[PDB]
Design a binder for this molecule. Structure first.
Ligand code: ZN
Length: 257
């Protein structure tokens, strides 16, 4: 029964998931004055030309855009990574207000929202096995600020009314996640965790420096989603972000000078 509500939010998660107080928890604040440029980091390779989205899902905590991950179709490689990581899903975290919503922060700046593109290391065969490994997942994180509309988001926005409440899904084929990327692939990277329960410490985080812009109208449609199920008391799906956690014995490394 975890959530982001008044009595079950992030500050409670440790009771059911004690790794919430672990050594490698996410998100974190990215201090741009202490992250060091690492010349050994490679350019990010994002190969999403054959990505096959299948469905969109309200899971009660966010919504997931899903992909067919039964072949190397949509892969992340390079960057900080060894090997090949396959796209399984993307989702967002967002605020009640434009001044909050992101999970990572940049010099304490909160963005309006954050997109997570989740990929699993193909050397472990499936997602469920990958999450049990420290190098099992690669999550590409992208900040959202409110300004211009993102035309490539509009397809997502337009389906949300059909998945208002928890448990609802809808066919969502042919969605191109390349339309959610900023121009630059400059990034920061560090080892961390899933940001929702079970909070497993299995993620190489790759957080892009350049945010995307979405319009106030687009974000407003996110904020009409519901955390409840059909026919239950309305609770708007907003503020579904975990705050920054202690960096502990980690370094944040920059791909760029
Ligand atoms: Zn996430």
């Amino acid at each position: 029964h975890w959530g982001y509500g008044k009595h079950n939010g992030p500050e409670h998660w440790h009771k059911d998931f004690p790794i919430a107080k672990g050594e490698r928890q996410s998100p974190v604040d990215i201090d741009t004055h202490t992250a060091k440029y690492d010349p050994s980091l490679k350019p990010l390779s994002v190969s999403y030309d054959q990505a096959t989205s299948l469905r969109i899902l309200n899971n009660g905590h966010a919504f997931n855009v899903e992909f067919d991950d039964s072949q190397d179709k949509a892969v992340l490689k390079g960057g900080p990574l060894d090997g090949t990581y396959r796209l399984i899903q993307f989702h967002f975290h967002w605020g009640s207000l434009d001044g909050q919503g992101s999970e990572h922060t940049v010099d304490k700046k909160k963005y309006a929202a954050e997109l997570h593109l989740v990929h699993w290391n193909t050397k472990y065969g499936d997602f469920g096995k990958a999450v049990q490994q420290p190098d099992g997942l690669a999550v590409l994180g992208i900040f959202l600020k409110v300004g211009s509309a993102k035309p490539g988001l509009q397809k997502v926005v337009d389906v949300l009314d059909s998945i208002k409440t928890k448990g609802k899904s809808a066919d969502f084929t042919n969605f191109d996640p390349r339309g959610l990327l900023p121009e630059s692939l400059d990034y920061w990277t560090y080892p961390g965790s899933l940001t929702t329960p079970p909070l497993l410490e299995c993620v190489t985080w790759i957080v892009l420096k350049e945010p995307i812009s979405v319009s106030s109208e687009q974000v407003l449609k996110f904020r009409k989603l519901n955390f409840n199920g059909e026919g239950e008391p309305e609770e708007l799906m907003v503020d579904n972000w975990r705050p920054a956690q202690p960096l502990k014995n980690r370094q944040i490394k920059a791909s760029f000078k």
